[PDB]
Ligand binder design. Structure first.
Ligand SMILES: Nc1ncnc2c1ncn2[C@@H]1O[C@H](COP(=O)(O)OP(=O)(O)O)[C@@H](O)[C@H]1O
Ligand code: ALF
Ligand SMILES: [Mg+2]
Lengths: 133, 448, 448
DNA sequence: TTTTTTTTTTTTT
């Protein structure tokens, strides 16, 4: 899935959490496991420059630490630039996923009580951006 | 139940990656094939996209779905929904190389496991197959895997890689105080001047008229190669028994006329001189010999490999002579038989990185010409012999042909062909009584 | 549950033979060792005998029981009762050679199975080992099995052995020839050297073009074997009546021009010779000849077994010839029909432990080539004839194809395959008038 | 899978 790579990259590469844009704006219910995803970024922001051990130390006693270590062992990448690029691609995947969800909500709005010219172009423009990426 | 090795996640990565990107196709086609996929649905999908790519058409969900539908494999793989999920799952095609290598590794181990099962089944139930049959079958299966794995990076290397390898070799040669003679010393300084020793991976050919100088000269090369080196030298005497050539060699190293040696007289005055030479040979243990009349290229390759992987590399190989080797399959045509033998000998030299000396006979067309000096075209059952040879030496003695000759006892080696180096002639004195060739210390002529 | 292959009877028979005869313990020890068995107690017993031989004490029931009792192994091996039973199973100590070979064969098969099991273990759980490690491990194991066999004809002879053989044979030759033969006599001394006689359990083959002495040669072998032994010999003449076969034998043994016998234009001297021959044959009375036509592998087995049981074994079996037998079940694919026939004969040969001589024809492609000497690929409908054969002899007579050839009345026996010993050419004199072959007493040209 | 008979092109002695 898309989540396992994301968490695996983050645990293996704690320095990636610094360059993560905020996620609290969108509800975490949309994507499973996204609630802790922003929390890890918040922990990194509160304590910039932390090793993987420090990141795992904060949640040594948590019940989700097993998944973090398991994904860390999985898909081990020696290259760091590739990991950064992959995380960017994975993060880019989430951004359009949020846009797709917004498009779906707009489509439901369309099928509920139609659309007007302003609503049509708004959803229509949103589709182009989603299609472009 | 032991699940056969495979990585579905790795596979789902490459199919999804190839979905997103078409340019990286060659990056995966060189690494994996349809069969290597563990699941039949993946095999069918790989086959379908290969047909799509070979047609010069783009790869996309519509095309792949359409292609599978025409061939009826759309439902067998899962249908349109299954393909859509595969495309969506893969984030990007950046890491498709490692995934492909992993898939190839899984397939190879899967093949190895099946081979292990296959060999085990045969052992349990010989079904009339002898232990040799099982030994041969296992050896073939191991070889087939080894050769399949052999071609990994065989491709059009760029010049930058080629240049770096070459300059390293040149610097190696320059540093080593070889001072000429990069290969095995021939023992004759004049010959080494033009040849610089017998280079590795070469196919040297010594040719002459019947009973002219062939086995005498070739044995001298073998003796010198053994004396001036520390690597075993192999001899294939398909024409005459090992007892006779050893006797000839003992005379050559002792400089005592054969005469009595053939009869078997251990005369004290001479036996003292030869005494010690057997001691020198015994301590060195540098020479291996196998007449085994009527060999085939495969048998020669098998025996050579065993010697190489037992004492460590080879120093030289001698064949006496080329025309006596037989290829069972290509028996109807003699021309093709010689081409197969010549090509095989060149391959063996490359494989073991050791000079290979082969002897050949000439044609009767030589006598017709006024000037009875051999040329490349005089080889017998020839044509393919002179294409693959890296160095060709003809043994000529004008004394035999013209009794009124100035070359009395002075043989001359004519370098008919040399791929890397000049050609010419070198004069050597011929000691028939001792069956030996010696450096021409007398007034030497100059090549035209 | 697959039980590893073994041979309990061979183990028991070998142990008993060793207990009876001690001078042959060295031969058994060299061929097989203690670890070559399948049952641990038998391995313990073999260790006991090896220890006794190292100390030099005689090996027998009393000594074996004493050593086992002192070491506490007497109860492990079932006590002295089983020690006596081990010899009771063994018929004689002379036949220990075959049983030891079976034990070695089972040991090799067991080792192969273990190596195959190890290969599967490593592949199933890589533990991190790279494919190279697995391949290198597999290659090393295969070489161990292939090389841990001893035997002979396994490679090129080195120098030290060659020099000793050269000097040793030179010294012996000028004093005496010292011919060994030491084989199941075929009657021709020159042929015993290259074959060591007709070894039991083999499947010998004789092939040649029509009217080349194929039946003449086989009959000579049958006659010579009959005189030089006491076991009965059997003949299956599917082509010629018993009368014609007997007429040739009378001409051959008595050295009388067979044209006179056929036409009845004999005289008193010839009648005297024939009468002498008939007296000798009736004195022995150990040749059985069947002229039934179109037999089947079942029929020959039933008849051969019946003759053996009535008179206690067969010393030789001759069939004339292979392609004439019939298998109604597989009466659509000739290739499969011949394959079944050849397999059945080999099974019968080992089942009775008696050499089986079968004749065969050759294709017409031989006559197309410039060199008309047969090769193993010329056997007619040779689906599996070459595979099952343990020894193949071809009969050639250059006088047939060349009136002016200097080899008038000279027949060459070309050995195209053999389990032990070399392969070469044996010359003989062919006296067609008497339907006989004779030793080539003339100048023994060196074979190239 | 094997044995048979007909064409046409090459290479060698
Ligand atoms: N009186 C004779 N003089 C000369 N040659 C003979 C005489 N009798 C038989 N032969 C030869 O002996 C050969 C034996 O042939 P045969 O063994 O029947 O052939 P095949 O190898 O098919 O069994 C024949 O080719 C025949 O020419
Ligand atoms: F004469 Al034949 F086989 F050809 F016995
Ligand atoms: Mg016959």
């Amino acid at each position: 899935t898309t989540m396992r790579i994301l968490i695996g990259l983050l645990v293996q590469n704690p320095e990636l959490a610094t360059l993560v844009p905020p996620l609290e704006n969108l509800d975490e219910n949309k994507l499973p496991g996204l609630g802790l995803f922003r929390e890890l970024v918040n922990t990194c922001l509160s304590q910039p420059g932390l090793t993987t051990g420090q990141l795992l130390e904060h949640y040594r006693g948590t019940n989700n630490a097993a998944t973090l270590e398991k994904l860390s062992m999985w898909d081990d990448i020696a290259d760091k630039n590739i990991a950064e690029q992959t995380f960017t691609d994975s993060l880019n995947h989430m951004f359009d996923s949020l846009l797709e969800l917004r498009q779906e909500e707009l489509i439901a709005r369309e099928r509920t009580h139609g659309l007007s010219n302003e609503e049509c172009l708004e959803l229509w423009t949103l589709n182009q951006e989603l299609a472009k990426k | 139940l032991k699940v056969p090795p495979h990585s579905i996640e790795a596979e789902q990565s490459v199919l999804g990656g190839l979905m997103l990107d078409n340019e990286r196709w060659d990056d995966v086609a060189e690494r994996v094939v349809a069969d290597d996929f563990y699941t039949r649905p993946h095999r069918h999908i790989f086959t379908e996209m290969a047909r799509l790519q070979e047609s010069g058409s783009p790869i996309d969900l519509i095309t792949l779905a359409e292609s599978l539908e025409r061939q009826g494999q759309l439902d067998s793989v899962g249908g349109c929904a299954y393909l859509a999920e595969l495309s969506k799952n893969t984030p990007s095609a950046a890491n498709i190389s490692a995934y492909a290598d992993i898939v190839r590794e899984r397939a190879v181990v899967r093949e190895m496991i099946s081979v292990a099962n296959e060999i085990a089944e045969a052992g349990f139930d010989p079904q009339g197959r002898t232990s040799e049959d099982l030994l041969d079958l296992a050896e073939s299966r191991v070889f087939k895997i080894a050769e399949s794995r052999a071609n990994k990076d065989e491709g059009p290397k760029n010049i930058a890689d080629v240049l770096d390898a070459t300059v390293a070799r040149i610097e190696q040669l320059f540093q080593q105080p070889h001072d000429g003679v990069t290969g095995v010393n021939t023992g004759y300084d004049d010959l080494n001047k033009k040849t610089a020793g017998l280079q590795p991976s070469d196919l040297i050919i010594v040719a002459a008229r019947p009973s002219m100088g062939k086995t005498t000269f070739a044995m001298n090369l073998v003796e010198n190669a053994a004396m001036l080196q520390d690597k075993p030298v192999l001899i294939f005497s398909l024409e005459m028994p090992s007892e006779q050539i050893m006797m000839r060699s003992l005379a050559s190293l002792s400089r005592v006329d054969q005469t009595k040696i053939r009869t078997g007289q251990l005369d004290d005055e001479d036996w003292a001189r030869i005494s010690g030479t057997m001691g020198i040979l015994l301590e060195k243990r540098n020479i291996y010999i196998d007449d085994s009349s009527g060999l085939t290229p495969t048998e020669v390759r098998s025996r050579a490999r065993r010697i190489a992987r037992e004492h460590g590399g080879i120093g030289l190989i001698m064949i006496d002579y080329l025309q006596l080797m037989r290829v069972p399959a290509l028996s109807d045509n003699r021309t093709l038989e010689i081409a197969e033998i010549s090509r095989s000998l060149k391959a063996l030299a490359k494989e073991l990185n050791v000079p290979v000396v082969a002897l050949s006979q000439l044609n009767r067309s030589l006598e017709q010409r006024a000037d009875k000096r051999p040329v490349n075209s005089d080889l017998r059952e020839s044509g393919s012999i002179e294409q693959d040879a890296d160095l060709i030496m003809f043994i000529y003695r004008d004394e035999v042909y013209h009794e009124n000759s100035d070359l009395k006892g002075i043989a001359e080696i004519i370098i008919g062909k040399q791929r890397n180096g000049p050609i010419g002639t070198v004069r050597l004195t011929f000691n028939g009584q001792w069956s030996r060739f010696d450096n021409y210390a007398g007034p030497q002529y100059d090549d035209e």
